[PDB]
Amino acid sequence: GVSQSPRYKVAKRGQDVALRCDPISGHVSLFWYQQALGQGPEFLTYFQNEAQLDKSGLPSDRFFAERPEGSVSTLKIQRTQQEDSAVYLCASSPTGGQETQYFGPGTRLLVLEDLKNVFPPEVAVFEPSEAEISHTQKATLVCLATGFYPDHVELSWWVNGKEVHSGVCTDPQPLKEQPALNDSRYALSSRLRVSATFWQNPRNHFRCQVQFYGLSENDEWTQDRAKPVTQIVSAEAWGRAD
């Protein structure tokens, strides 16, 4: 499949941002799309091999798209503005236009005035209730990622060093901790349900992993608190019989 890097990118107004797209091998056609919240992808530019056949969809000359070897394509946005904040999707077609399009997971770009309001998350695991085990014969583990900015996170459950998806339910969208504030911090919750016998077993290890996307090593930081870099914040809990 088509791959894109980075998955998330937070940038300061005036910075240059580089977006990478690796299409499917042999695919002659390549497309770049812009996607706004609650809308469909809007055409930006089209490539057939290395030749840029059209760029009428690009918002300005600051948007510079290239595919020099006719394979990997880059979209460089010069002097980024707040209006450039969107999901940048890239697609490929095997032999031309008006065909089946194969898309990448995209790059969620957010351009802010400054990066002073960005924060990493605080992850905490809440052990299941004794009343739950006594009423449903099931045990629900709740994870909470709090005080993070921006909304550039990926939550995953890890049982005995292996990632699980069954009985896992993460919120589709996080909530604002201060719904009144302009630069409000976000909060995300997730549930993991296992059988009563699986939780009561002390050999089982439960871990909630939250991959945060923040500042790069190239990004400037002068504030007293630690640099809110791209980091993994986790919370673990072991089996309890009680």
Partner: peptide, 30 residues
């Protein structure tokens, strides 16, 4: 080659709960 996409339709699949057992529980952190 220029493809026009719609705003999109969000589909909500309502889960069928065979035996409902509504309850509120209190969980404790480490």
């Amino acid at each position: 080659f220029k493809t026009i996409f719609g705003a999109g339709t969000r589909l909500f699949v309502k889960a069928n709960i065979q035996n409902p057992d509504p309850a509120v529980y209190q969980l404790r952190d480490s």
